[PDB]
Structures are given as structure tokens and as C-alpha cells.
Amino acid sequence: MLTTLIYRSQVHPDRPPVDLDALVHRASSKNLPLGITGILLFNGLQFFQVLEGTEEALESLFSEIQSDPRHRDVVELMRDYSAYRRFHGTGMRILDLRLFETDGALEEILRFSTFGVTEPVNDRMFRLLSAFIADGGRYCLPEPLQPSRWMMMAPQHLPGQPCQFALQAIVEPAKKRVSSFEALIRSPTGGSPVEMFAAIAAEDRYRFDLESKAYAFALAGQLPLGKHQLAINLLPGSLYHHPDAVGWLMDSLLAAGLRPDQVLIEVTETEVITCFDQFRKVLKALRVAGMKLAIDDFGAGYSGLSLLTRFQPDKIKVDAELVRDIHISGTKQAIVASVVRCCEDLGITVVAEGVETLEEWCWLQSVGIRLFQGFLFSRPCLNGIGEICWPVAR
Amino acid sequence: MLTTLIYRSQVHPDRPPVDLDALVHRASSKNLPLGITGILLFNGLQFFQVLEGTEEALESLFSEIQSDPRHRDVVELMRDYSAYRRFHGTGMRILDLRLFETDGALEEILRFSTPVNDRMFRLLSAFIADGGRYCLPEPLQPSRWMMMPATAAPQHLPGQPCQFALQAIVEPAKKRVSSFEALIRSPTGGSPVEMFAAIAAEDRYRFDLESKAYAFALAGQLPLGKHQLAINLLPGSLYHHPDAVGWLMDSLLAAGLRPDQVLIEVTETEVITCFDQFRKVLKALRVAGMKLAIDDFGAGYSGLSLLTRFQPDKIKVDAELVRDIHISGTKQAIVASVVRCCEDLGITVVAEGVETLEEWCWLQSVGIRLFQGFLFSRPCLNGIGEICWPVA
Ligand SMILES: Nc1nc2c(ncn2[C@@H]2O[C@@H]3COP(=O)(O)O[C@H]4[C@@H](O)[C@H](n5cnc6c(=O)[nH]c(N)nc65)O[C@@H]4COP(=O)(O)O[C@H]3[C@H]2O)c(=O)[nH]1
Numbered sequence: 001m002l003t004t005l006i007y008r009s010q011v012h013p014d015r016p017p018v019d020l021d022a023l024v025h026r027a028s029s030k031n032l033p034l035g036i037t038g039i040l041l042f043n044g045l046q047f048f049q050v051l052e053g054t055e056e057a058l059e060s061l062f063s064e065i066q067s068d069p070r071h072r073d074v075v076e077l078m079r080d081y082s083a084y085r086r087f088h089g090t091g092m093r094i095l096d097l098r099l100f101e102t103d104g105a106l107e108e109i110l111r112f113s114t115f116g117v118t119e120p121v122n123d124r125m126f127r128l129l130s131a132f133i134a135d136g137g138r139y140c141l142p143e144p145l146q147p148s149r150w151m152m153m154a155p156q157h158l159p160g161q162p163c164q165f166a167l168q169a170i171v172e173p174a175k176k177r178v179s180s181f182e183a184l185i186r187s188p189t190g191g192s193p194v195e196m197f198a199a200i201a202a203e204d205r206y207r208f209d210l211e212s213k214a215y216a217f218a219l220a221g222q223l224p225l226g227k228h229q230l231a232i233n234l235l236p237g238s239l240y241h242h243p244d245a246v247g248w249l250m251d252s253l254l255a256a257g258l259r260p261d262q263v264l265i266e267v268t269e270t271e272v273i274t275c276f277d278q279f280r281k282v283l284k285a286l287r288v289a290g291m292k293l294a295i296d297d298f299g300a301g302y303s304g305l306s307l308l309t310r311f312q313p314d315k316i317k318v319d320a321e322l323v324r325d326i327h328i329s330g331t332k333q334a335i336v337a338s339v340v341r342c343c344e345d346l347g348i349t350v351v352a353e354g355v356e357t358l359e360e361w362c363w364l365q366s367v368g369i370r371l372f373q374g375f376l377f378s379r380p381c382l383n384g385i386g387e388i389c390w391p392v393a394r
Numbered sequence: 395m396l397t398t399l400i401y402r403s404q405v406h407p408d409r410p411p412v413d414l415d416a417l418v419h420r421a422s423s424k425n426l427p428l429g430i431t432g433i434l435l436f437n438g439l440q441f442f443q444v445l446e447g448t449e450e451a452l453e454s455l456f457s458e459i460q461s462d463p464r465h466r467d468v469v470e471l472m473r474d475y476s477a478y479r480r481f482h483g484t485g486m487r488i489l490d491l492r493l494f495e496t497d498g499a500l501e502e503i504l505r506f507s508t509p510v511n512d513r514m515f516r517l518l519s520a521f522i523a524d525g526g527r528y529c530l531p532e533p534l535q536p537s538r539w540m541m542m543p544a545t546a547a548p549q550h551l552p553g554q555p556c557q558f559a560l561q562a563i564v565e566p567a568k569k570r571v572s573s574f575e576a577l578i579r580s581p582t583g584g585s586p587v588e589m590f591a592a593i594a595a596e597d598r599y600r601f602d603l604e605s606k607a608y609a610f611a612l613a614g615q616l617p618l619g620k621h622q623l624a625i626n627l628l629p630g631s632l633y634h635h636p637d638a639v640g641w642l643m644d645s646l647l648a649a650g651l652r653p654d655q656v657l658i659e660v661t662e663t664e665v666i667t668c669f670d671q672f673r674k675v676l677k678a679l680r681v682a683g684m685k686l687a688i689d690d691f692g693a694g695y696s697g698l699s700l701l702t703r704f705q706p707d708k709i710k711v712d713a714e715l716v717r718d719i720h721i722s723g724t725k726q727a728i729v730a731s732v733v734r735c736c737e738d739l740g741i742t743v744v745a746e747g748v749e750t751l752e753e754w755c756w757l758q759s760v761g762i763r764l765f766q767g768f769l770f771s772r773p774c775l776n777g778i779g780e781i782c783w784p785v786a
Pocket residue numbers: 168183184185192193194209212233234235296297353354355356373374375376380
């Protein structure tokens with residue numbers, strides 16, 4: 001079955017320039033008997049390749065290409081089924097963009113290429129080609145943000161309590177600064193939030209979720225606290241199945257020596273979406289009281305920034321599924337960069353969570369993320385502040 | 395109940411400089427007895443104002459401000475309930491941003507106000523850093539444009555269980571018609587709601603699919619040419635007989651049309667509820683060669699997570715996001731982000747329900763080039779309607 005594969009990559013500027021002549025001669029000669037067609041674009045620093053052929057033949061070739069030491073930062077942009085070949089000729093075509101001016105490159109592409117009965121601008125492949133020609137260095141990973149240039153550098157449990165809390169830090173690595181702490185619920189035996197809520201009767205889970213926060217506020221009250229935000233997770237139901245849940249949280253946090261502005265509530269969009277008029281009453285009560293709110297797991301389940309027409313949170317936490325393998329996904333790169341920009345324009349804080357690798361941290365930083373949560377920096381610490389690992393040079 | 399109101403605006407660059415001394419002086423003197431506080435930022439071309447006070451007082455004030463001839467392009471950025479007054483003891487005060495060094499303006503603000511964890515402060519920072527971002531350019535001012543006149547030919551086609559109205563999707567910068575969208579009508583000329591209500595509930599999926607033959611027949615006889623044909627389908631009507639894609643393929647080819655010429659429109663709200671069955675339809679569409687568009691993008695608040703699963707050829711920005719975009723900083727930020735994301739992904743963006751020049755101008759400023767709405771073209775029963783173009 002005919003398939004299209006589109007990727008971008010970049011060269012090593014430190015090494016001798018790649019023989020473009022030998023590359024394209026051997027490519028075109030290998031591709032032809034395998035039924036592989038397409039075009040290669042080169043701007044002096046970046047490669048852009050469109051590959052056409054069977055799914056099995058493109059998977060075999062991309063594996064060899066990803067593995068090729070001539071280039072790095074290989075980012076897949078498109079991979080889908082096709083009805084016709086766009087490129088024709090007994091081999092791989094190549095354009096050195098540096099030697100074309102203004103729109104001569106798009107002119108040479110359109111010489112031998114077929115884009116159907118409608119205008120070429122109606123083809124996604126052509127639009128992706130145009131975007132690389134007009135502005136290719138856009139998602140080119142900067143040299144200081146190359147992952148290869150980076151490397152990475154006590155408290156007891158409480159079984160007597162009905163619940164305990166683990167703390168995970170939100171960090172800003174550029175200033176080596178802890179931004180805030182998120183409280184994660186744990187069972188008396190140190191079990192997960194799943195295990196904890198499973199032990200609670202279903203009709204009592206909303207009330208338990210709200211009242212467990214008294215133990216989170218108390219813990220935060222005994223810690224070197226001072227002036228970091230405390231994020232707590234709540235179901236929206238737990239907030240409005242109660243006569244004054246906002247006022248209850250208010251009394252509970254103030255008795256622990258915390259401030260309204262220091263406490264942030266984390267809810268997801270999936271949880272909120274079914275009940276806007278119910279939630280907007282709760283958010284209003286939170287705002288007036290002085291408490292903050294984040295939209296958590298933004299990317300998982302129902303997620304869109306058109307949600308921001310209903311209300312604007314103080315913070316948006318980008319889901320770990322958008323963060324996962326962002327270094328190779330053109331789709332995830334575009335989406336996260338879009339979130340960063342929208343929130344910057346609206347004055348909404350952005351946190352990327354589930355950050356596990358340097359490659360994730362580096363690419364998230366290139367698209368504008370400054371606040372990070374994940375195992376790479378700091379793991380959740382039961383009833384205390386865990387150690388933070390900072391990325392250092394070399 | 396305390397409320398915060400934040401907006402930005404632009405001066406008239408060809409008119410004499412307004413005495414801002416007298417403006418702010420009178421403002422501060424009027425604001426304080428009414429329980430209104432805040433500040434004004436000025437960079438030479440743009441204003442940025444924070445207003446604090448009751449919902450009633452700020453409503454009354456902002457209404458006078460919106461009608462004020464001293465400025466234009468008033469864009470509301472924030473309106474929400476507030477915990478406390480950030481500018482207590484300051485009815486109104488102006489800061490000329492050109493009179494400050496790099497962090498100087500922000501440090502002055504903090505010395506007289508009552509902080510990066512505050513949304514108001516972050517919005518203040520954004521205007522100080524890059525305030526010219528959503529500043530509407532001079533050639534894109536609504537007053538610099540005017541719509542043109544011009545002839546349609548609607549025709550009743552008998553012996554059909556349904557008819558189709560055609561509305562053009564246009565590119566005004568090239569005065570070019572991109573595509574035509576087929577909108578179903580009853581044999582009498584009634585709405586899509588009027589048509590489907592006459593069909594039995596369990597036969598509505600089949601009817602939706604089968605009716606498309608009459609849309610292809612229309613398109614082939616209009617000569618179509620190098621134009622796309624957009625058709626509206628329920629996802630359910632696509633995974634329903636086993637050969638639904640193949641049926642549609644046979645029907646369009648017999649009409650003289652090409653696969654790449656036909657685009658399928660499914661709404662964001664209906665797709666998200668059935669990813670699992672839509673996936674096999676997606677494979678068949680791309681093997682066959684037909685295109686896919688996500689319609690009403692934004693209406694189900696799940697467009698971003700949808701682009702994670704699959705990438706359509708086109709998205710059509712919901713008419714609600716287009717509505718009042720000229721005064722909504724929220725919608726301006728959202729649409730501009732969507733446009734930027736789609737540009738990176740190679741997805742075509744079309745704005746829906748474009749009714750006014752104000753909408754078209756601000757849509758243009760955030761990157762949109764394809765437009766659908768009553769401003770340019772109204773739906774025409776079984777034919778190509780007349781198209782109005784904006785002229786400078
Ligand atoms: N794989 C991976 N995981 C990472 C990484 N960094 C952090 N995590 C983890 O992801 C979870 C936090 O995500 P969440 O969306 O808050 O998801 C949480 C949160 O929703 C939650 N939860 C925690 N406390 C409460 C609570 O008090 N009430 C409610 N309703 N939910 C809670 O239950 C979910 C499961 O939480 P946890 O076991 O505490 O697991 C934590 C955590 O350890 C990473 O780099 N990689």
C-alpha cells in the first residue's frame with residue numbers, strides 16, 4: 001500500500017560537510033528498484049525529505065535514515081496512506097536551497113511533480129515543503145539545547161493517619177529554582193491514589209478528597225514552606241458537593257499558617273467540561289477567596305484552548321503524553337509551542353509534566369517551556385521535600 | 395463585589411496628540427469617589443489599562459471608554475472577579491514606557507501598587523515586553539476597506555429527495571474561490587434540520603450518505619474545474635455499510651469528479667465521541683484519495699487533543715470563535731495559536747461565519763487566508779452564487 005513519509009533533520013556543524021552528491025546518487029539508485037520516490041531539501045544546516053512507497057519499504061528505509069550518523073535531530077512530520085505518487089523520475093531529487101532565490105526552489109519542485117486536479121496549495125505535502133523553504137530554521141534545535149551537551153547531577157511515613165501526602169517539586173532549571181510543590185495523596189501503607197480511593201466507599205469519595213487536604217496543608221505547614229506554592233488535586237465534584245468547600249479549605253489552610261494566594265487547586269478539563277455552570281460558581285468562589293487554579297493534564301482526554309473562552313485558569317499543566325517523545329514528533333512540537341504562545345498572550349503559567357529525559361527537557365525548552373515537573377529533576381517524596389537534580393553543562 | 399477589567403487599544407496616528415495629563419488627571423479624580431482604581435500604560439501607539447472596582451462601576455466606565463474618539467481598536471483582555479485591590483489609593487495613573495529602562499517600568503509599578511504568580515502582573519509584563527504583537531496594522535484597519543456589489547442563478551431541481559445549496563470558500567487576497575461547500579436542502583428548499591426531520595431516525599445515516607450522489611451530480615455539471623467540493627457527513631454514516639467509502643468513491647467518479655477534489659467534513663464534537671470507529675474510516679479515505687476536514691473546530695473544546703490522534707487536511711474554525719474577535723483578546727490569542735499550529739502541521743485553516751469587515755480584518759491579522767461567510771458569499775440553491783470582494 002502506498003504511503004507517504006515526511007521528516008526533517010539537521011547536520012553536525014562541527015564535522016566536515018556531507019557529500020550531497022554521493023548521498024543522492026546512492027539513494028536514487030537504491031530507491032528505484034524498491035519503488036521509492038521523493039525529494040530532498042537542504043538549506044546548509046537542515047535536511048527535509050519526502051518519501052513515497054509501500055509501508056514496509058518506508059519503514060525499512062526510515063530505520064536506516066534515523067540511524068545515519070550524517071545527521072541528527074530527526075523529526076517525523078507526516079506518515080500516512082496515499083492514493084498517488086507526487087514525485088516522478090528514476091531517482092531521488094535534491095534541492096540545495098542556498099542556491100535558489102526567492103521562489104525558484106518551489107518552481108523546480110513544481111516542474112516534475114504532480115499534485116492532482118486542484119491547485120498544489122491544496123496538498124498537505126506541498127504546504128509542508130513550502131513551510132521548510134520559507135522558514136525551515138523554526139524548529140531547528142539550537143546548539144545550547146543539544147541534549148548531548150548536558151548531563152544530570154530521610155523523611156518517614158505516617159501509617160496512623162487516614163491518608164498521607166507525597167510532595168513533588170515544580171522546577172525552573174534556568175534559575176535553578178523550585179517554583180512550587182504538588183501534593184499527591186497516598187494510602188496509610190504508602191499506596192497510590194488509586195489504592196487510597198478504592199479503600200473509600202464510593203458515596204464518601206468526594207468528601208474524603210476534600211477533607212484529606214487538611215493533612216496536606218498541615219504537612220506544608222511544617223516544611224520549609226516559606227513562599228512556594230502548594231498545588232493540591234481535587235475532583236470538581238468534591239468542591240461543589242458541599243455547602244462551603246471553598247470556605248472549608250480556606251479555614252483549613254489558614255489554620256496551618258498558609259496563605260490563600262499560596263494554595264492552588266488542580267482540576268482536569270475532562271472533569272470540568274460536563275459542568276461549566278457548576279464549575280464557574282466554584283472558580284468564582286476560589287478567585288474571590290484568593291486561591292489559584294490550574295487546568296491539569298492538558299493534552300489528555302478532552303483538551304483544547306477554546307476552553308479558555310469559558311474561563312482562564314492561573315496555570316496550565318501540559319500532559320505527559322504531549323511531553324513523551326516530543327523530540328521526534330513534529331505534531332507534539334507544534335501543539336506544545338501553540339499552548340505556550342496562547343498562555344503567554346493570556347498571562348497563563350505553563351508547566352510541562354512527566355519530563356523524564358534530557359531530550360524532552362531540551363525540546364520543551366526550545367518551544368518556550370520554563371517550568372518543569374518530572375522524574376528527571378525530582379521524584380515525589382513522602383511527607384517531605386525530596387532532592388532536586390539539576391542539568392549541568394557537559 | 396470587586397472586579398478586574400483589562401483592555402488594550404490604539405491611538406489615531408494621523409491626529410494631534412491627546413493631552414494625557416488632563417485625561418489621567420480627570421480620570422483619577424473621577425475614579426476614586428466611585429471606588430475605581432488602576433493604571434494606564436502608554437508606548438506611543440498603544441494604551442493598556444487595568445481597571446478595578448465593582449462589576450456595575452466598571453461596566454459603566456468601560457462603556458464610556460469604548461465610545462471614546464481618542465482611541466480605537468479597544469480589545470478586552472480580562473474581566474473577572476477579584477480577591478483584592480492591586481492599585482489601592484490610585485484612581486488612575488499613567489506610565490510612559492518609553493521613559494523607562496529594561497526592568498524600570500515594572501519596578502515602578504510595584505513601588506506604588508498593592509508577583510509573577512498574578513495574572514494581572516503577567517499581562518502587564520506581556521504588554522511591556524511585546525505590546526505591538528496584536529496591534530492591528532494600518533492596511534488592515536476596517537475603515538480602509540469596502541465590500542463590492544455584483545450575479546447568482548438559483549435553480550429548483552425536481553425528482554430529487556433532497557437538494558443542495560452551494561457556498562463558496564474564498565481567498566480575498568487572490569480574489570480566488572478555493573472550494574464550494576454543499577449544504578443540504580429539502581425538496582421544498584428548507585433547512586438541513588427540516589430535511590432530516592422528514593427522514594426516519596434509523597434511516598438518517600443511510601440518507602446522509604446516499605444524498606451525496608446528488609451533490610456530486612451538481613458539482614460535475616457545474617463544471618467545478620480546479621475547485622474542491624466540501625460535503626458534510628456524520629461519522630456514523632461513514633461506518634455503517636462496509637463499503638461506504640467505496641460507494642462514495644464510485645458515486646463521485648461517475649459524476650466526473652476526482653477523489654482529491656472531494657473533501658469530507660466531520661464536526662469536532664461527533665468525532666471525539668467515536669475515535670475508535672473513525673480510525674478505519676480514516677485509513678479508507680486516505681487510500682482512496684479523498685480529503686478530510688474537521689468542522690466547527692473549537693466548539694467541543696477538544697480540538698488540540700484531536701490533532702494528537704490524526705491530522706486532517708483542513709480545519710474550519712468555529713463561527714463562535716470568529717464572532718466578536720475584533721474586541722476579544724481571548725479569541726484573538728486562541729485563533730492565532732490554532733493558525734500557527736496548523737501552519738506548522740501543514741493544515742489549511744478556514745474561518746467560518748465571517749459576517750463583517752471587522753472580523754475579516756482581525757482574522758487576517760492573526761494569519762487566516764481562507765474565509766467562509768455571508769460577507770463574501772451566501773449559499774445558492776443548486777448553483778454558484780455571487781461573490782463580494784473587499785477593496786482597499
Ligand atoms: N511516569 C511518570 N510519572 C510521573 C512523573 N512525574 C510525576 N509523575 C507522576 O504523575 C502523577 C501526577 O499526575 P496527576 O495528573 O496529578 O495524576 C495523579 C492525581 O490526579 C492524582 N491524585 C493525587 N492526589 C490526589 C488527590 O488528593 N485527589 C484526587 N482527586 N486525585 C489525586 O492521582 C493521579 C495518580 O497520581 P500519582 O501516583 O501520585 O503519580 C503522580 C506522579 O508521581 C514522571 O516523570 N514520569
